[PDB]
């Protein structure tokens, strides 16, 4: 957990994201914000987005989607050896942004949804298993840092 085979699947799936990082990033955030409107309130810069149409037309939302998925991609390519990459994000998200770990669960689920939505029939059962494991590992390691900091 994860096996070499599983990491290979994760990084193969990630190639899909890398072909259109901004599009995937945008759809992940829109899925997050529409499914869980409380998450929007954590972003002073997105609180004005009162409709999905406005979300889709927001170039800054797309920009942030790129920032988020680029960060995640860098972490995934470490294949679990990600302490240095993950540390600042756990600290900024717990201490500055005040993001409950529950919201990281939400965004993880959103990634899985968007992969199926954008690649229906091309995100196989093995691939979903591997990507889910990778996102759980990410969450688990963030959670350990949150506990250190006494957040939530
Ligand atoms: C895959 C999980 C996530 C990744 C990789 C990620 C990554 C990032 C990065 C790289 C930044 C800019 C640098 C920083 O402040 O640390 C950032 C900022 C931020 N993130 Fe996340 N994030 C994730 C999940 C979330 C979630 C679920 C929320 C809220 C529901 C959130 C809220 C924020 C906020 C409010 C900012 C500051 C925005 C600004 O001031 O421009 N993040 N995130
Ligand atoms: O959109 N997560 O920073």
DSSP string, 18-67: HHTHHHHHHHHHHHHHHH-HHHHTT-TTTTT--SHHHHHH-HHHHHHHHH
In whole angstroms, give the CA distance from residue 2 to residue 82: 13
The finding on whether 68 has its CB within 6 A of some atom of ligand 1 is yes
Which of these, 113, 104, 97, lies nearest to 24 by C-alpha position?
113
Backbone conformation region of residue 80, classed left if phi is above 0, alpha if psi is from -120 to 50, else beta? left
| Residue 69 alpha carbon, nearest atom of ligand 1 | 5
Token pair in block for residue 53:
């149409």
In whole angstroms, give the CA distance from residue 130 to residue 152: 28
Kind and range of the H or E run holding 125: helix 125-149
Resolution attained, angstroms: 1.2
Asked whether residue 64 is marked as a ligand-binding residue, the answer is yes
Asked whether residue 81 is marked as a ligand-binding residue, the answer is no
Q: Can you give the residue ranges of every domain in the chain?
A: 1-152
| Expt. technique | X-ray
In whole angstroms, give the CA distance from residue 135 to residue 126: 14
In whole angstroms, give the CA distance from residue 36 to residue 19: 27
CATH topology of domain 1-152: Globin-like (1.10.490)
| Residue 106 alpha carbon, nearest atom of ligand 1 | 27
44-81 burial: b if 16+ Cβ within 10 Å, else e? eebeebeeeeebeebeebbebbbebbeebeebbeebee
Contact 46, 33 (CB under 8 A): yes
Ligand 1 centroid–CA 68 distance in Å is: 6
């Amino acid at each position: 957990g994860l096996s070499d085979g599983e990491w290979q699947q994760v990084l193969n799936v990630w190639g899909k994201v890398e072909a259109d990082i901004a599009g995937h990033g945008q759809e992940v955030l829109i899925r997050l914000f529409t499914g869980h409107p409380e998450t929007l309130e954590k972003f002073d810069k997105f609180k004005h987005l009162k409709t999905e149409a406005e979300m889709k037309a927001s170039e800054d939302l797309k920009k942030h989607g790129t920032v988020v998925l680029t960060a995640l991609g860098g972490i995934l390519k470490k294949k679990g050896h990600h302490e240095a990459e993950l540390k600042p994000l756990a600290q900024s998200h717990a201490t500055k942004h005040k993001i409950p770990i529950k919201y990281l669960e939400f965004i993880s689920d959103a990634i899985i949804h968007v992969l199926h939505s954008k690649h229906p029939g091309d995100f196989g059962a093995d691939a979903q298993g591997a990507m889910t494991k990778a996102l759980e590992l990410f969450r688990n390691d963030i959670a350990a840092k949150y506990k250190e900091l006494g957040f939530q």
